Paper text:
To further investigate the working mechanism of the phosphatase domain of PTPN21, we determined structures of PTPPTPN21 C1108S in complex with a phosphate ion as well as PTPPTPN21 C1108S in complex with a Src pY530 peptide. The tyrosine moiety is mainly stabilized by hydrophobic packing with F927, A1110, and V1112, and the phosphate group is coordinated by the P loop and R1114. The catalytic water forms hydrogen bonds with the phenolic oxygen as well as Q1152 and Q1156. The WPE loop is in an open conformation despite the bound peptide. Alignment of the peptide-bound open PTPPTPN21 C1108S structure with phosphate-bound closed PTPPTPN21 structure showed that the phosphate ion and the phosphate group of the phosphotyrosine are in a nearly identical position, so is R1114, despite around 10-Å shift of the WPE loop. Furthermore, E1067 in the closed structure is within steric clash distance (1.9 Å) with the tyrosine moiety in the open structure, further indicating that the closed structure might represent a conformation after P─O bond cleavage. When a phosphotyrosine substrate is present, for catalysis to happen, E1067 would have to move to a certain position between the open and closed conformations currently observed. Close examination of the electron density revealed that C1155-C1070 in the open structure formed a disulfide bond, while C1155 and C1070 in the WPE closed structure are free with a distance around 3.9 Å. It is possible that the open conformation promoted C1155-C1070 disulfide bond formation which prevented the WPE loop from clamping down.
PTPN21 belongs to the four-point-one, ezrin, radixin, moesin (FERM) domain–containing protein tyrosine phosphatases (PTP) and plays important roles in cytoskeleton-associated cellular processes like cell adhesion, motility, and cargo transport. Combined with biochemical analysis, we have found that PTPN21 PTP is weakly active and is autoinhibited by association with its FERM domain.
Author numbering:
A (entry chain E): 528 to 531
B (entry chain A): 877 to 1171
């Protein structure tokens, strides 16, 4: 879900 | 020449004093206002975003001709433009396509007149898919794929070690027209951190220029060119490195004072989070420095  | 050597010393000292770190951290990662990305956030579009926190702004998103399945013509992609000395450098920054968005990606390529794709990711990294394989494999028996109205043919491929150059042919099935598309995939980006081999990445930027050379057919050097399509997994970190690097090298042409944070600020106004880590930003400095050394 989240690009980190 | 002495002007380049002076600019090189200035770049090196900004790195030596740590000022490259300071200037990076004060650049906002996303727009303070008017960065709602309301179309990208629609429930009907959630399946079209690889990452829910990396989205295009409404004013600059790439709009597809709407279809019944895709009412807003949404694709996670942003128009990027920066003028250098009168020459508008045009780019489209997009995420790595998913299985459900390959048709959208190729429709985008067609409608925007794209002839060059810069893919700056491997397809899988760390056991996770980063980009669908949206173009066919080489080999006479299986080198074609159809995504909706577009049949794509892989025609040739060369491997240069840090990157590979694939020639594609794209056919609009409704009307029969064909266009050649070049696919330039950087394969040497490390799993963690940023590359230590500057030469390989510089040769990749040089190949992008060589493919611009192949595809330029307008006598007028000021005549407009279709945007370069740049994509990674989210279409922001390694994607921003390519775009900032190309613009900054073009700034080295004329006597324009180099202002890398200014240019990155303008880029981020057009797509959030471009150049997504500190090592990617220092990497741009190192690329510019190595570029000036090899002049």
């Amino acid at each position: 879900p989240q690009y980190q | 020449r002495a002007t380049n050597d002076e600019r090189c010393k200035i770049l090196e000292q900004r790195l030596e004093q740590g000022m490259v770190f300071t200037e990076y951290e004060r650049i906002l990662k996303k727009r303070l206002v008017d960065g709602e990305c309301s179309t990208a956030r629609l429930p009907e579009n959630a399946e079209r975003n690889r990452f829910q926190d990396v989205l295009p702004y409404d004013d600059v998103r790439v709009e597809l001709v709407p279809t019944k399945e895709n009412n807003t013509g949404y694709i996670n992609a942003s128009h990027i433009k920066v003028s250098v000395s009168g020459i508008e450098w045009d780019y489209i920054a997009t995420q790595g396509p998913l299985q459900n968005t390959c048709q959208d990606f190729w429709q985008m390529v067609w409608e925007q007149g794209i002839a060059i794709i810069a893919m700056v990711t491997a397809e899988e990294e760390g056991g996770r898919e980063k980009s669908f394989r949206y173009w066919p494999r080489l080999g006479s028996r299986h080198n074609t794929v159809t995504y909706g109205r577009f049949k794509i043919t892989t025609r040739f491929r060369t491997d240069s070690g840090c990157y590979a150059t694939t020639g594609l042919k794209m056919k609009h099935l409704l009307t029969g027209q064909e266009r050649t598309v070049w696919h330039l995939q950087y394969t040497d980006w490390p799993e963690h951190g940023c590359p230590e081999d500057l030469k390989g990445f510089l040769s990749y930027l040089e190949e992008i220029q060589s493919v611009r050379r192949h595809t330029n057919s307008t006598s007028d050097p000021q005549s407009p060119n279709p945007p370069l399509l740049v994509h990674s997994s989210a279409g922001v970190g390694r994607t921003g490195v390519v775009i900032l690097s190309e613009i900054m090298i073009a700034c080295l042409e004329h006597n324009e004072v180099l202002d890398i944070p200014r240019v990155l600020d303008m880029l981020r106004q057009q797509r959030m989070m471009l150049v997504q880590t500190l090592c990617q930003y220092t990497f741009v400095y190192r690329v510019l420095i190595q570029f000036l050394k090899s002049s």
